[model samples]
Target: MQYKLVINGKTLKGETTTKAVDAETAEKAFKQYANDNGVDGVWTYDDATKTFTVTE
Candidate 1:
């Protein structure tokens, strides 16, 4: 299944895949996507706050 990871109302350019449904897993997935796409930025998901942040 695919999910959308949006920041500031804009969908990010990548996909996240993982069996783990926690922040750790999500973070890893996001990182992989960023690295694969050569995105030189920081991406993070806060489980407690349910927020996704990306900084380029």
Candidate 2:
């Protein structure tokens, strides 16, 4: 299946998509995407239907 990740931060501000069967895998994919894109800080991301603020 396909998944999506929405980032609303200072450095990287956009939505990214990836193909992953598992939701956790897609979550990890978003992290890698953020790292590779040099998003500055560990910003929050939003999943498909669930928007997250990463306030843990």
Candidate 3:
């Protein structure tokens, strides 16, 4: 399936589409994408949050 990564309520700047096996994989993919993009202060659901924060 496909997944989207939204940053600070804006799904345009850092939005992306990725494939994953399940919700867990989707979250991982989103987190990896954020990390790969060099984003800081962004938290995954594992860290506990509905939306990730963009500190930059």
Candidate 4:
């Protein structure tokens, strides 16, 4: 499945595209991205839309 990580933090502010075989993998990828980018915010995921939104 395809996933999007929307960032809304000072460290990084944009959308990241990633591919995962399952929801669990997607979440892990998102968290890793956030951690690697030093992003801090509220992260939300919508499985139906395959979208991950981050709000500060």
Candidate 4 Cα misplacement greater than 4 A, ranges: none
Alpha carbon lDDT of each predicted model: 0.55, 0.60, 0.55, 0.81
Clashing pairs in 4: none
Error of 3 at 7 (Å): 2.6
Q: In model 2, what are the clashing residue pairs, if there are any?
A: none
lDDT of 1 by residue, 1-56 (tens): 23335433234544334445566566667667666665656566655555556666
After TM-score superposition, the amount by which residue 53's alpha carbon in candidate 4 deviates from its true location, in angstroms, is: 1.0
lDDT of 2 by residue, 1-56 (tens): 76666666764567667787776777776777677876645444445564333221
Reference-based lDDT, residue 3, model 1: 35
Q: Mark the regions of model 2 whose C-alpha exceeds 4 Å error after superposition.
A: 40-56
RMSD of each: 4.7, 3.8, 5.2, 1.4
TM-score of each: 0.51, 0.61, 0.51, 0.80
On a 0 to 100 scale, what is the lDDT of residue 49 in model 3?
31
Would you give me the overall lDDT of model 2? 0.60
Over 4 Å off, model 1: 1-4, 7-20, 44-49
By lDDT, the best candidate is 4
Per-residue lDDT of model 4, residues 1-56, tens digit only: 78888888765678888888887788887888787777777878787998989887
Alpha carbon lDDT at 29, candidate 2: 68
Return whichever of 2 and 3 wins on TM-score: 2
